[PDB]
Design a protein around this ligand. Structure first.
Ligand SMILES: Cc1cc2nc3c(=O)[nH]c(=O)nc-3n(C[C@H](O)[C@H](O)[C@H](O)COP(=O)(O)OP(=O)(O)OC[C@H]3O[C@@H](n4cnc5c(N)ncnc54)[C@H](O)[C@@H]3O)c2cc1C
Ligand SMILES: Cc1cc2nc3c(=O)[nH]c(=O)nc-3n(C[C@H](O)[C@H](O)[C@H](O)COP(=O)(O)OP(=O)(O)OC[C@H]3O[C@@H](n4cnc5c(N)ncnc54)[C@H](O)[C@@H]3O)c2cc1C
Ligand SMILES: CCCCCCCCCCCCO[C@@H]1O[C@H](CO)[C@@H](O[C@H]2O[C@H](CO)[C@@H](O)[C@H](O)[C@H]2O)[C@H](O)[C@H]1O
Ligand SMILES: CCCCCCCCCCCCO[C@@H]1O[C@H](CO)[C@@H](O[C@H]2O[C@H](CO)[C@@H](O)[C@H](O)[C@H]2O)[C@H](O)[C@H]1O
Ligand SMILES: CCCCCCCCCCC1=C(C)C(=O)C(OC)=C(OC)C1=O
Ligand SMILES: CCCCCCCCCCC1=C(C)C(=O)C(OC)=C(OC)C1=O
Ligand SMILES: [S]
Ligand SMILES: [S]
Ligand SMILES: [S]
Ligand SMILES: [S]
Ligand SMILES: [S]
Ligand SMILES: [S]
Ligand SMILES: [S]
Ligand SMILES: [S]
Lengths: 421, 421
């Protein structure tokens, strides 16, 4: 309300949870902060591939949100938004209730666009998903069914995907788990299908020796790999794959039987956000300026996967660049600073900073990780790492992030860099 | 003097130059800051290998100090200290003049311990040095003489060395330059001799895949490599090498003719500092606490290569861990903070922080670099990088560091990390 702006945060994920705490900390008792999310629990997304192979359980990576934000004075609504009216500034919830806002911060993350590939929905066929704990559990269930009746395995990433790391991770740990169970030789064929122009392109034109190292890794595991692929449909338990050359000309089509499969889908914006007129590009990603403010509505901000970021390259099969944790947190930090500024007259000048990508993958005893910045080459940092220490770091960071999600963040979040001091 | 402490900084190198500026900035006009150094010019040490092969000239990497520190109000004495009397707090200069201090900050860097290996002094035989611009020029001169009369080449690192990167760098660019001149096939043999237990140990038990990558690099260049070596003497233009096994038992002795050679020597403390009773360990390195204060004299501090750092490992042939730029700067920063604190009653609690090692090497078009921390494994960061971007970064950092040495530093120095903001 006037003189006491009501700030709503839509989505309680990697960006959204921290945003709720930071907003409340920045605004204080004189303003209402409301967090709205489809689920009543927080999940640590990077741990889902492990749930998909059964190395982790839901309880390890998820927890109920309500008590933790409420003791901070944040209102929490565990309800999905179905409609956003940016004119009236009203949000319509799944139960038909309406919530008004003075500022809205959109952190709704990706819609998994299974519809791009008929038959690819995890509920429609053998191609599963590990992006959410709900999907990863279903993936693991189908993995167990594979163990009972071995058959061909197909893991990879669809056309338009932007999150390639976890597909590589998942293929590796599936291969690893199979060995452990003494079941690897029961597998007729193990295939990796990707929209990448080459192995380890990762939607970022490669980083360090990602190409060489991921190529050798897949080969060590007896995983046959195909690049420049798009899947046209999944039908009768078969994946119909089309492979192109540099000029997008078809050089072959394949039909792959699939007993167990997992393809990372293309990401779009969620329907309630995409549905807002003039808010989003055709992909449903919120068009924002460098201050995280929507270009159309001055009182709508966005952070996380939900925002639009222009491509810097074009691949033979469409692919996108990933939006990862540190950049998301910088986005969140900027949005909160600039909203608070608005509330106090001044114009916030804070930006998300330099584009970057960071990813950690754990194979069990050893991890792989990379850091790339900025987006276009030659970069200022372009590094790929592998080893037991990367694994230890993943474990440490997960423990830290989850604890922080329960304790609240102020916060200039990433000061876990004081491991220098 | 009383109420106006006189602070002296001994050594105008990587640690010393910044220390002079930071001291003056921290203390201001009420205190006298004096910089004393053997040479009247600053040199960018990491560029010396390039001077040693002739890819760079003295003028590119060195500049006269006086005008730059004096316009900051810093007194500059271009004279070597011969004696330090810590009781009377007097420094005796080469010309016999004496300089008194209330606080002394020692940044004298390494003494190149050629005496450990009879005949190894660059002025006594064919084994040259690239650690200083004076030595690197002499190295290049002998390189040109090699071109006139090709003969065997021997490059590497002595027993007790702690700075291995530049030996690898130098071997690589010598090989590279030879090719460019169409002279590589005129070389009878090209040998790399190191005290490391294995290739790419680098005195830090390896970092990332340094072992694999440096091994392959030397092999690509037709450079035959030997580890676990110590050189017992250089005589009649031959290098007498002893190789041991894991238990330090001799497994062979070699006699290597040398037309052109360069071995990184072991580092000790400079004589004037080592000469101070109770100041140093037997190596001549200043024993300091975590606040950079000498354990014996409360008004003597030290930073840079000059300080003693305990070994965390023991190799078959003695070797040491390197002391590199970022850690040196943290040392400097801490010493300055704690001296200023002393001057104002309080006890400074600032420390150098976590042990780390960082090194950049440029091969011409592409560079290699690493970061390791902390000292002992498993590390929190253990990364090796290679590529054109590393080269671009070396070029950039050198340009930046030199400009800063002319303009002065305040300063929380390394904020060239805002390439994130
Ligand atoms: C398998 C996988 C592995 C990954 N690994 C890494 C890694 O190692 N390192 C790294 O930096 N990044 C990693 N990421 C990338 C990234 O950081 C995550 O995807 C991250 O969770 C995205 O943050 P977000 O806040 O934008 O979206 P999300 O975390 O998905 O949060 C979005 C939230 O808003 C909600 N929501 C959606 N629609 C509505 C609605 N209509 N109404 C109400 N709520 C709604 C959601 O249910 C959810 O809680 C990974 C991503 C995936 C899928
Ligand atoms: C070949 C080589 C390559 C290197 N490359 C890297 C790299 O890529 N990255 C990195 O972080 N580090 C690198 N280093 C390591 C390191 O950072 C440097 O050695 C650095 O110059 C050390 O800083 P310092 O202030 O301790 O000693 P120095 O830089 O040697 O400065 C010491 C100074 O004090 C003086 N002095 C000595 N005795 C006296 C005396 N009795 N009286 C008066 N003055 C005296 C000197 O003449 C000199 O000016 C390299 C070192 C070498 C030798
Ligand atoms: C971050 C997301 C991106 C992808 C995530 C999942 C990808 C899977 C990674 C496959 C790598 C497997 O293969 C593994 O790679 C590295 C090669 O650098 C090798 O390891 C090599 O370099 C490392 C350091 O980085 C050294 O410690 C090691 O001694 C050396 O052999 C291993 O011998 C090999 O077994
Ligand atoms: C920092 C100080 C330590 C040592 C300094 C001097 C050491 C010399 C380095 C020798 C390396 C030469 O060999 C070179 O190594 C890397 C291997 O990772 C290869 O490069 C490989 O990884 C890089 C990324 O890191 C990719 O961009 C490249 O496409 C891939 O082939 C090169 O194909 C090879 O030519
Ligand atoms: C240039 C800055 C790089 C920061 C990286 C160092 C430590 C943090 C790891 C990155 C990371 C972040 C930020 C992160 O937010 C996140 O959760 C989604 C991860 O998944 C485990 C991450 O691996
Ligand atoms: C954990 C912190 C790592 C910092 C490294 C990023 C940028 C700086 C490069 C390191 C470096 C420093 C600090 C440095 O002081 C120095 O001069 C002696 C170099 O030689 C060229 C260096 O390469
Ligand atoms: S997925
Ligand atoms: S991703
Ligand atoms: S990724
Ligand atoms: S990722
Ligand atoms: S040297
Ligand atoms: S060094
Ligand atoms: S080094
Ligand atoms: S170095």
């Amino acid at each position: 309300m006037r003189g006491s702006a009501h700030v709503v945060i839509l989505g309680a994920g990697t960006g959204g949870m921290p945003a709720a705490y930071e907003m409340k900390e920045a605004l204080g008792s004189g303003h209402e902060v409301t967090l709205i999310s489809a689920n009543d629990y927080f999940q640590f997304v990077p741990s889902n591939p492990w749930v998909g192979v059964g190395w982790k359980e839901r309880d390890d990576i998820a927890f109920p949100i309500r008590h933790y934000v409420e003791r901070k004075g944040i209102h929490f609504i565990a309800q999905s938004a179905e409609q956003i009216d940016a004119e009236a500034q009203n949000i319509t919830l799944a139960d038909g209730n309406t919530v008004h806002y003075d500022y809205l911060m959109i952190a709704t993350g990706p819609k998994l666009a299974f519809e791009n590939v008929p038959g690819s929905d995890p509920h429609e066929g053998p191609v599963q998903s590990i992006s959410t704990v709900d999907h990863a559990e279903r993936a693991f269930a189908e993995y167990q069914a594979l163990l009972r009746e071995p058959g061909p395995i197909v893991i990879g990433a669809m056309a338009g995907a932007s999150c390639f790391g976890p597909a590589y991770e998942y293929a590796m740990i599936v291969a690893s788990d199979l060995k452990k169970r003494g079941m690897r030789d029961k597998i007729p064929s193990f295939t990796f299908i990707t929209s990448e122009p080459y192995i380890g392109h990762l939607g970022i034109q490669g980083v360090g020796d990602s190409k060489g190292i991921l190529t050798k890794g897949l080969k060590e595991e007896g995983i046959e790999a195909y690049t420049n692929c798009k899947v046209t449909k999944v039908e009768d338990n078969k994946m119909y794959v089309t492979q192109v050359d540099e000029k997008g000309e078809t050089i072959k089509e394949m039909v792959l039987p699939v007993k167990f499969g997992m393809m990372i889908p293309a990401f779009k914006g969620v329907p309630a956000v995409a549905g807002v007129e003039g808010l989003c590009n055709p992909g449903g990603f919120v068009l924002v300026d460098e201050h995280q403010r929507s270009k159309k509505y001055a009182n709508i901000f966005a952070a996380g996967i939900a925002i639009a970021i222009p491509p810097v390259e074009t691949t033979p099969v469409p692919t996108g660049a990933p939006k990862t944790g540190y950049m998301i947190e910088s986005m969140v930090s900027a949005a909160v600073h600039n909203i608070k500024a608005d509330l106090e007259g001044r114009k916030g000048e804070q930006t998300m900073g330099t584009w970057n990508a960071v990813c950690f993958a754990d194979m069990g005893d050893r991890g792989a990780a990379f850091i790339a910045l900025p987006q276009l080459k030659p970069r200022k940092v372009d590094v790929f790492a592998y080893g037991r220490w990367v694994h230890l770091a993943k474990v440490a960071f997960e423990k830290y992030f989850i604890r922080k999600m329960k304790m609240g963040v102020s916060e200039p979040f990433y000061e876990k860099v004081l491991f220098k001091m």
